[PDB]
Amino acid sequence: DRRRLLGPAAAKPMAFEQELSLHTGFIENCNGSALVEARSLGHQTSLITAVYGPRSIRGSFTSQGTISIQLKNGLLEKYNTNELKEVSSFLMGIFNSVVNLSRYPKSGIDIFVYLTYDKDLSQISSLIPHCITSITLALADAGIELVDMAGAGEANGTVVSFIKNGEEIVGFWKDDGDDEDLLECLDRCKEQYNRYRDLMISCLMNQ
């Protein structure tokens, strides 16, 4: 590789109570940033979300804004690049309802979400509600108008995102798990949403 330093190509790699921590506005490189850390049982997750925008696009005739989300692997190389694109597509399907696009014509908002540390003692399903929490904080910190606070929860691999105080749904992610958990997951994630919502609102007011 003439772009980076990959080293010797003839070598081989190595072969062998909910708690939240929220911090926003700690990056001066962008317009809005957020830090989300969650520790539960034997599984903790720490990720960082950066928001760059809204910045004008030359020649753009779009009467509304354009959101782009990309997930990255900060340290541990676990999640496939194909799967990262899938979640990104899912995340954009959420905030396109959340973000007031009519406010930013001829403009675009780029969202970078760095997945730093994730310990585990499906798989990426559990990180999804934390990514939504991070982005919604980073957007609100950046100054981007949001119609409502976006939040979600993970119950038996079934992720569902809520707005308008859980009355409606802005995203639904079902992978593996089992059946007939429709009513249960909707009630369990709604509790996680309300919990994540109040902590998100408190996070923006305090600092």
Place this chain on the structure above:
Amino acid sequence: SLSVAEKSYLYDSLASTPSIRPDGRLPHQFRPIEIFTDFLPSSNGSSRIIASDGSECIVSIKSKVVDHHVENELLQVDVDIAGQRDDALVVETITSLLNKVLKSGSGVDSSKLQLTKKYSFKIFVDVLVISSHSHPVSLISFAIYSALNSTYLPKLISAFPTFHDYDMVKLDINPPLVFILAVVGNNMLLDPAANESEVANNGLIISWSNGKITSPIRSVALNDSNVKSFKPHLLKQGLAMVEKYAPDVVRSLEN
């Protein structure tokens, strides 16, 4: 790319209580398709599907031999869309989605591809989308389904590697189906047209295996403009809609 005058017309027409589709279809009607099978001798299985809008998808089924103890995934689905990159956002999304739809521990029996206690058949599924005027996730799904129904592999000889030089094995399995739904106002829609998805408030991707709803189940945004939140009753309605009209489409594609 429709004008606002068209979008405002189609929305008011679809969001109405007696929802009128632009083509007259009922919320459960499917557009007429055409499926060709077994047209590739070099491959173990093949399929081709033509849609109403002119959408086309070619799916090829090939296989090899490898240890199933060193390989957890015996089913690899690759998607190549014409005029699109291999690292494109939509391409890698569908590539990742179909792999979850067809997986050894999701919607596909792993014992079916089991020959011996040591070696087993690994199936390579290739997808070539010639034309796409909408979300091909449902179109490709019907193509992979018909491709796995008509498949021929080298026939085994011993038990628990050698193969039969002439006679072949026909893989009989129940491949999963993926039905994309459109959420417009308070009404649910099956098989969204090109122009319908551009005004739809939201959308649903629902899978189907063994006469029952199964994972993956996603909520995709069919557009980037008129995307709005939806009530939970629409998800229960949509799922039930797929549930009752699935034995009809399965029965049709069976012949």
Place this chain on the structure above:
Amino acid sequence: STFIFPGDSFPVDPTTPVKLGPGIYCDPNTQEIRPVNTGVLHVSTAYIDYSSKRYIPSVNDFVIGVIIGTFSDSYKVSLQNFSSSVSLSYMAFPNASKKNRPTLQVGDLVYARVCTAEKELEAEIECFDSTTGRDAGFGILEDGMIIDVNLNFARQLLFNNDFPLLKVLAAHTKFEVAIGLNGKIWVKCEELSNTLACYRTIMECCQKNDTAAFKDIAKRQFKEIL
């Protein structure tokens, strides 16, 4: 000879007023005069002669350009490859007109002089001198052949009349010629064999660069085609 190097001290005393020129640079802050090129300093007037294959737009310079584009406001003419374009106005032609525009296609050779040439602005040329009877050979150059040479060989050929090129070529053949200061030389004859004979001479003379070797090369070149 007195050879000069960039950064060296300037021999000329700052007491007596001396007009500037190409080759020397006036520092916008320290106000000191220093050489920026390598060559021979000529003091009559103060300038430095240095070897350069690349031409730069300058006032009152005869150049041979090629039309690379035709706009509504002016012409886009390239005096040299990869260099920035030059603006040739429609009114820069003799017997100009308002509605009616001069007839020039893309690729036509034009012999014009540079009127206004700013460092930070697009240069401009005019197909009529300001002025020398309006006819110094200015205008469209029909047919013929052009040759790329260094700027040193071009200026000495046009200005200095002691240069044994037009003198030695006139004896071998009768022809009309136009020389630009951008390293372009346009020569047209009657028979094609004569034009080819002239091209091969200048090509060899520019390479060897010898004043007394002009007659020797011209003798063997014209006898080679026969």
Place this chain on the structure above:
Amino acid sequence: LETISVPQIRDVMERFSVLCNSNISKSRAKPVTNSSILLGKILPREEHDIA
């Protein structure tokens, strides 16, 4: 404004007051400290200078 009913303004206000009281007024969850799990200690560090 004279087209729309005036007492309806009192109606949509009462339906607005009963909307807020039955929505944002109800929220209860056990208080959780914002103590750092991993990077929360060092990332939002206040800028200090040394001489």
Place this chain on the structure above:
Amino acid sequence: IESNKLAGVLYESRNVAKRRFEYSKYRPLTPSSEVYSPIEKESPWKILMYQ
């Protein structure tokens, strides 16, 4: 002829030859290149003002 463009030229030539003159009053309301008139605009004083 050698460029096969003769059919087009004779076509455009006939359309030139069939050009009909008509007074400004009895001119067609739709502007065309097949009918000529001194004034082709209903309000010719409009373009005079904006100039």
Place this chain on the structure above:
Amino acid sequence: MSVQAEIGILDHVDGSSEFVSQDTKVICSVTGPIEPKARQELPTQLALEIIVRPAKGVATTREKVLEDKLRAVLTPLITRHCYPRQLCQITCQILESGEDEAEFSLRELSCCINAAFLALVDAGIALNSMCASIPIAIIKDTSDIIVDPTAEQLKISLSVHTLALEFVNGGKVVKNVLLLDSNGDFNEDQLFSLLELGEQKCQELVTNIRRIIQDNISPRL
């Protein structure tokens, strides 16, 4: 430290040069002032496009460092405000490593500097002053300072160095140090002892360079 150099070996380029030192041979070429790309345009100053390719393989991050270090030297040399909104393409191709290219890149760096400056002269670009670069190394055992070493002298060397100085007034007075690179274990005393021998040897190559230009430029005029 006997070297060899030629001027104007390339035809279709505005200016070129071919530098030879020991075994490392780096040929350079310069085209400008020419039309710049939209992304390279500088409203006031002059844009510099520097390209350095190795003798074997394709240009990697190693050569990206060589381009970055070479840029630091040629930048203050050229009077950028003489050519507003313009481009200068400087390409340095290494013909032979003349050393161990995997471990040391400081020999080729000095040669890329020398060849580039000569090309700048040939192309006829506005230069504020002159320049000269020499490779220096310090052996672990002998602990002596060697100016312009060889390949075998680098393998047993403790620390490698690179010096490039700017010269004014007949190539005698030093205006400022343009580039000073050092790699390996060395103290402060060895540093000031490096410039003591370096500045002496630099001026030796400056006056050596000056006479090369005279022999090539003068016959053209």
Place this chain on the structure above:
Amino acid sequence: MTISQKLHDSILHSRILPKKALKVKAGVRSANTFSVLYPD
């Protein structure tokens, strides 16, 4: 690009990591389950 190379070159030239410090001292695993022992 430059930083990645500058970090690699400086570490290499500052003599921080010897090639002997990267030598892998292997071991064996025999069945008694499986017990692993290393030479000391």
Place this chain on the structure above:
Amino acid sequence: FQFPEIAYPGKLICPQYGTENKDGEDIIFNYVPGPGTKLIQYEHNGRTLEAITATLVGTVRCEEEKNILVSVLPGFANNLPKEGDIVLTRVTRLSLQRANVEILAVEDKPATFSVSQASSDLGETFRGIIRSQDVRSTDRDRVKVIECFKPGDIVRAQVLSLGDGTNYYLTTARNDLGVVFARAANGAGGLMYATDWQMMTSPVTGATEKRKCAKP
């Protein structure tokens, strides 16, 4: 105001219309959305409802102009070049019939300015074009652009028309508009100050360059 003072994104502020009883007559308060607010639709009791909802975290301000305007003020984006505003720009390139620049900051209203943060090495920064006829009111026909502006010089101007979605159209016709900050020799020399309206001098090297200067 009987309405919540502090508002997070998604918090209900006030309904569509409002009214009160005073002086024996009904006064109608008309609530209209503003910067930070968004009129959306909610459902309750099987009946639709429209109410003003804040979209940005901050304090709610209810003001009236010679109707009640509901807006939310954060603790930049809203600021955008509009016809009549004064804008500080920097010359990117000079042509013969015009002079294009890039927008850096915009003057506020009662000095204070609003700095637009963008990358100047990309082109994401707003670009603007100053016509040759918009240089000065004196002799609008013939104007030498070389003797007016210069690459790198800072120019204070006022935007006339936005035109298309690419370039803004400015002007320096009035006295308080023109080249503000500039240096000798395209920035190579020392700093220069504005004396005469058509002359800029440098009280350091004694250099004088012809520019279009504003009034101190």
Place this chain on the structure above:
Amino acid sequence: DVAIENNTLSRYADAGNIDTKNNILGSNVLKSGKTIVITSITGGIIEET
């Protein structure tokens, strides 16, 4: 000012509980002023001949 966090992202962060999934041999988090730096060290094995 310089404040760091070493061995926080490594698998050898905790003596008792060792991460079976994490392949990081050594790590460091650094923040000098506004700029933050996160370093992770991984490894590999190659046959030398």
Place this chain on the structure above:
Amino acid sequence: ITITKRNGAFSDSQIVTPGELVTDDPIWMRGHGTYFLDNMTYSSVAGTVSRVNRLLSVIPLKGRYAPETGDHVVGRIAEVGNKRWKVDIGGKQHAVLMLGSVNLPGQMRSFLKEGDLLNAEVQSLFQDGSASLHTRSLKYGKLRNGMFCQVPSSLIVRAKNHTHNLPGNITVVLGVNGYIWLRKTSQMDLARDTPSANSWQIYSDENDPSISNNIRQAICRYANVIKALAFCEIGITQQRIVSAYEASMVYSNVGELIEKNVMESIGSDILTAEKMRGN
């Protein structure tokens, strides 16, 4: 859902092919599809030999829409720059629409923007074959109050009037380019050709506030029959549409017309009816 599973597989008119000599007579005038080489005329495309008067040409079996002066076409705005509009009429090139070729009442994006459909007339032609659009008429303008559908350009022949009124209170705009627009019959549509023998709302983006379901399903059904006639490669005329719309009334639900066996039924019905009462 309908499927089709097939396994194992995937005064005369002269037919000519590229390279074939059509005639050895240099007298004829060279037209389209033919190139001249040494007094011989060769065909450049594959199709039928068209001999009309002095003009000799070859008609291709299939080709994009060729714009002619006076053609009533329906187009979509592709891009807007300077003082012009470039409209897509489904031709080889984008038709152009000058600012002086529209109606200004008493920032061009406030009138027409990317995505907007419109009907216009080909005012003139450029040398490259591009068409110059002209919307200055009471019959032309920005399109609304309906739905768009596309049929092959070779299925709609030129006519004196391309805007027809149909039973069901809807109106069709049969463009020569194949682009068709169905809409609710307005005041202009009702009385247009009749009063002849007897303005800021024209660029509005909003449709008619009151669209009855009787018209929506009419617009819907009229669209299904047109694309059905196109499915059978039948030339669409105002009579073919009305007949198909009436012949499709035997099907209660409108959605049943989307089927292949149903479309070919309506198509064959008109072909046999016009053949029976035509002779």
Place this chain on the structure above:
RNA sequence: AAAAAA
């Protein structure tokens, strides 16, 4: 995305 007659 200027052009032709007088």
